[PDB]
Amino acid sequence: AAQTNAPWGLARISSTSPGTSTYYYDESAGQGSCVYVIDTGIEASHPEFEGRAQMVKTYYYSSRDGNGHGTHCAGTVGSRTYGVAKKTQLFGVKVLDDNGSGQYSTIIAGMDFVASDKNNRNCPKGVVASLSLGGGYSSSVNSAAARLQSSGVMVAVAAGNNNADARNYSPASEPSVCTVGASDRYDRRSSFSNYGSVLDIFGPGTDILSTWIGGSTRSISGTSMATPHVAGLAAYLMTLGKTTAASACRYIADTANKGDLSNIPFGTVNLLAYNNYQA
Numbered sequence: 001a002a003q004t005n006a007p008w009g010l011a012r013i014s015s016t017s018p019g020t021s022t023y024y025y026d027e028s029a030g031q032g033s034c035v036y037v038i039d040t041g042i043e044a045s046h047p048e049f050e051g052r053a054q055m056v057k058t059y060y061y062s063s064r065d066g067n068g069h070g071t072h073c074a075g076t077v078g079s080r081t082y083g084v085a086k087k088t089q090l091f092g093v094k095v096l097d098d099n100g101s102g103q104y105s106t107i108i109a110g111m112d113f114v115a116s117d118k119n120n121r122n123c124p125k126g127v128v129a130s131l132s133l134g135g136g137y138s139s140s141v142n143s144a145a146a147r148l149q150s151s152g153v154m155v156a157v158a159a160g161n162n163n164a165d166a167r168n169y170s171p172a173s174e175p176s177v178c179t180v181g182a183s184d185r186y187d188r189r190s191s192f193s194n195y196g197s198v199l200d201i202f203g204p205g206t207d208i209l210s211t212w213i214g215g216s217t218r219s220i221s222g223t224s225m226a227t228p229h230v231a232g233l234a235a236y237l238m239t240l241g242k243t244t245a246a247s248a249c250r251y252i253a254d255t256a257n258k259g260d261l262s263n264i265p266f267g268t269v270n271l272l273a274y275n276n277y278q279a
């Protein structure tokens with residue numbers, strides 16, 4: 001399948017070169033997979049989600065996304081226009097309040113929730129969790145992400161936005177999950193992207209168009225935007241049968257575009273997520 005006039009990041013993940021604007025992908029499109037978006041919520045009523053999104057858990061007075069961040073990330077995973085995996089099922093877990101803030105204890109509870117809740121969902125092709133959040137190093141936060149991964153969920157986490165080594169942030173620094181840095185449309189490391197040995201992969205993160213609350217759209221930047229590209233890619237590849245939740249991060253690294261990004265510090269992987277789709 002070909003989506004013309006796609007957001008640059010979608011075009012990038014199906015291309016061997018920057019500077020194109022059509023997204024190419026297998027029509028299976030993540031059907032039969034599920035992606036949890038652990039964030040500020042999801043505006044599931046947005047037409048872009050086509051009934052495939054739902055809130056399953058909140059720790060606050062509402063499950064609605066009063067911020068936009070979680071809706072944007074969910075749109076990059078799986079919206080019809082802005083999403084990588086256009087037929088996946090999206091499940092929202094609201095661990096962040098409407099200002100985008102949340103306590104680590106709530107975030108940990110949300111990760112353990114997903115590890116159990118997947119047993120209440122139909123995801124025959126596999127389960128992914130996208131965590132566009134983080135803070136300072138916490139062994140307990142890292143352990144929660146490790147448990148979620150161990151339980152059979154492909155965990156993708158944002159590297160962080162401090163232009164610093166991600167070893168000092170969580171869950172970014174957990175070795176067993178997929179830690180995602182950000183790139184721009186010219187294949188440069190995004191100016192804010194964290195780096196370091198703990199990164200596994202880069203995805204599009206600067207000037208990413210996606211869904212927003214109020215049935216709207218907007219372009220924003222962050223490792224929060226790169227992470228759902230990788231989460232959606234994992235769901236797509238699992239539906240194709242090319243990989244599994246346990247192996248998807250390594251498979252994405254194996255099959256990435258290699259050596260194409262600029263301003264990658266010595267010792268950080270130079271790997272850009274790529275679907276290897278041959279139309």
Ligand SMILES: O=C(O)[C@H](O)c1cccc(Cl)c1
Binds near residue numbers: 160169170171224
């Ligand atoms: O840069 C920040 O805001 C935080 O350090 C951070 C760390 C890890 C992941 C995210 Cl999305 C944010």
